[PDB]
Amino acid sequence: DEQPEPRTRRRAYLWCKEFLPGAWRGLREDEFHISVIRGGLSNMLFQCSLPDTTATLGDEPRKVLLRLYGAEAMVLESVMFAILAERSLGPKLYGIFPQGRLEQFIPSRRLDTEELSLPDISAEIAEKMATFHGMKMPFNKEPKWLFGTMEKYLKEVLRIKFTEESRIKKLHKLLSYNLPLELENLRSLLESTPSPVVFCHNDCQEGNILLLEGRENSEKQKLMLIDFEYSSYNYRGFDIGNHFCEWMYDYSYEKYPFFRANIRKYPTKKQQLHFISSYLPAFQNDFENLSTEEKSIIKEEMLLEVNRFALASHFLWGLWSIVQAKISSIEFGYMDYAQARFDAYFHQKRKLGV
Amino acid sequence: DEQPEPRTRRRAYLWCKEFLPGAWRGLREDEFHISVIRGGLSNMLFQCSLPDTTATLGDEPRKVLLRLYGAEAMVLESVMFAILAERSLGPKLYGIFPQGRLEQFIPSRRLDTEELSLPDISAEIAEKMATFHGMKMPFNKEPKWLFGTMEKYLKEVLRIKFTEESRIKKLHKLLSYNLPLELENLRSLLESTPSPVVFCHNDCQEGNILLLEGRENSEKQKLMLIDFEYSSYNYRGFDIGNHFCEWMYDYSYEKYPFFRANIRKYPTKKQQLHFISSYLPAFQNDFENLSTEEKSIIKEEMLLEVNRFALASHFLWGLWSIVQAKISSIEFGYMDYAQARFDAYFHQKRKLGV
Ligand SMILES: CN(C)c1cc[n+](Cc2ccc(CCc3ccccc3)cc2)cc1
Ligand SMILES: CN(C)c1cc[n+](Cc2ccc(CCc3ccccc3)cc2)cc1
């Protein structure tokens, strides 16, 4: 039950006392409870609560989450969060300030990688993503995010000068593929792959899906998608393809390189069909009322769409991870992860016949 | 029908084409229509529209408002605007970017000063303000805004060194009252005046109230309150008192000092009672079900509350206007307006016996 630094405790007390109504407003510092949920250098998370012996005066929360950012993007992220809260699609927003946010506390745990393949879990994720994709949001709707970001990362990657031997070697191998040309071949494939532009999460992995406390044995409505900070208008195929890729990566491994990758855990076509069978009628209202024939065509075209876009998940996050090897202050086997994504990229490309 | 600068036209075209869906996305520059609604140095407003010969593809707007800011506050204002849009309490928000916003276009005109006293108009304003005051918003709830802002302004005002003769003279007269002491006497009065802390508009004047096109002959729901940028948690008495003060000031006068002030146009007690009779049951659900006796007590206490807080509208905006005389690039008789507010302050104080 980790306690924050006295400085952080006092700042948290003041934020809660000033931004939250009812019993919070008259709270004494020596009555304030706070514990560290997640440490680190950025997005530190704390649980803040009233004393058990303090009654609420109205409908103020008894417990809240404090997010500290640490050490235009701010405007967009804050507006998006506020909008998703209003629409009941994310945690409520209780307070916003230069240093962080006070959010609704949602009793829950995160999903584990293996849970992504449970049929009921996968069905709900599909429904939740289809819902998220229907959001109208006040952001640029031109789908420049995917290749814009890949181009940016590629430029950064080409110019990295490592000083450490193993990183120099792994980088040389990764750049030996001719990434500018390969990126262009990917662009060509994806340009011939129709995929609607929708508000995408862009990071639908197990670590960003809450299993809601007390709902674990309920068939539906037991999940919440969170951590929208990378969301943007983007190709629908990317969001689904990226999710499918996440079946293969477990980030909870406690030893170096602090992840495991398993190509054999990518969803089978049967599993993908189960997922898209839940996605489609959640995204397109009267989908169920189409002929078995037209449903099957729509499903077949979507399978090809999402599996082609899955290549962009590998390519983008592969480049991303090389960049983190250069710039990150967090411990993780970034170069080995990069190699794993590019290995998966070529394996997938082969299976596609592309 | 004023046209913007070619540079502004092109930027507006690009914002509309990228942030708005359907027919907007394929629009050609030579088809784009834009006209200036309001010029100036900051918050320039433009109307943007599709050609009459272009059909919409879905439910995209045919016409929008572009606001350009010109030359933490940004985060808070943008979040507030997004939240009020979600709740149907302001215009929809279609796009947000560093330079401005794309908003819903609301066919309307602003109210004139004399229209504030029409019984049906005043009743609706009361209902709209009571609604606004029920908003829960993710902002600091400590009511430091009123005297915080007055202290800030007073400090600035004391140190102004004008070079122009008439401004030097008018300032000396305004500071002759001993404003630090008078501010403290006001604080003392208001500390003894209970007033709930609510989300306040802080600027409920005729220029910020839309009369909705086609609703002009409807008894109810013909107005919208807009221009929330000065909104904050604050004493309810201030928002209502400030509105009452606005009955006296007409900002449409075309000759120097570009406003008229008339002490005799302040609402009578009968008129104030009509306003609060609409406010209370809009703010407190089952108010109508209280005894005539308890309703009358609540009305009497509110009359005293709002009329005491009206003194703070005079004092705050009086100081504000002195500051604008020093710093503003807009033409207006700021020193004469300041004198008018302080004249009203003392007149009101006398009538209160305070
Ligand atoms: C920026 N963005 C939306 C993404 C970046 C990377 N990825 C893939 C990914 C996800 C998680 C990780 C693990 C991060 C981590 C680092 C240190 C300890 C534990 C986890 C690595 C790569 C998906 C989306
Ligand atoms: C910052 N704030 C919420 C306020 C500031 C001033 N006032 C009173 C007020 C309102 C309008 C004006 C007129 C502004 C104006 C300036 C030049 C041309 C036309 C109007 C002056 C004073 C109310 C609220």
Curated annotation (Swiss-Prot), chains A, B:
It is linked to Neurodevelopmental disorder with microcephaly, movement abnormalities, and seizures: An autosomal recessive neurodevelopmental disorder characterized by severe global developmental delay, impaired intellectual development, microcephaly, early-onset seizures, and movement abnormalities. Changing residue 72 to A: Does not affect interaction with PLIN2 and PLIN3. Homodimerization or heterodimerization is required for the choline and ethanolamine kinase activities. The lineage of its organism: Eukaryota, Metazoa, Chordata, Craniata, Vertebrata. The modification N6-acetyllysine is found at residue 144. Its EC number is 2.7.1.32, 2.7.1.82. The chain holds residues 80 to 457 of 457 of the full protein. GO terms for biological process: CDP-choline pathway; cellular response to glucose starvation; lipid droplet disassembly; lipid metabolic process; lipid transport; phosphatidylcholine biosynthetic process; phosphatidylethanolamine biosynthetic process. Homodimer. Heterodimer with CHKB. (Microbial infection) Interacts with PI4KA/PI4KIIIalpha; CHKA bridges PI4KA/PI4KIIIalpha and hepatitis C virus (HCV) non-structural protein 5A (NS5A) and potentiates NS5A-stimulated PI4KA activity, which then facilitates the targeting of the ternary complex to the ER for viral replication. The modification Phosphoserine is found at residue 176. It catalyses: choline + ATP = phosphocholine + ADP + H(+); ethanolamine + ATP = phosphoethanolamine + ADP + H(+). It comes from Homo sapiens. Belongs to the choline/ethanolamine kinase family. Plays a key role in phospholipid biosynthesis by catalyzing the phosphorylation of free choline to phosphocholine, the first step in phosphatidylcholine biosynthesis. Also phosphorylates ethanolamine, thereby contributing to phosphatidylethanolamine biosynthesis. Has higher activity with choline. May contribute to tumor cell growth. GO terms for molecular function: ATP binding; choline kinase activity; cholinesterase activity; ethanolamine kinase activity; protein homodimerization activity; protein tyrosine kinase activity. ATP binds at residues 38-44, 67, 104-110, 205, 227. Phosphocholine binds at residues 40-42. This is Choline kinase alpha. It comes from the Eukaryota.
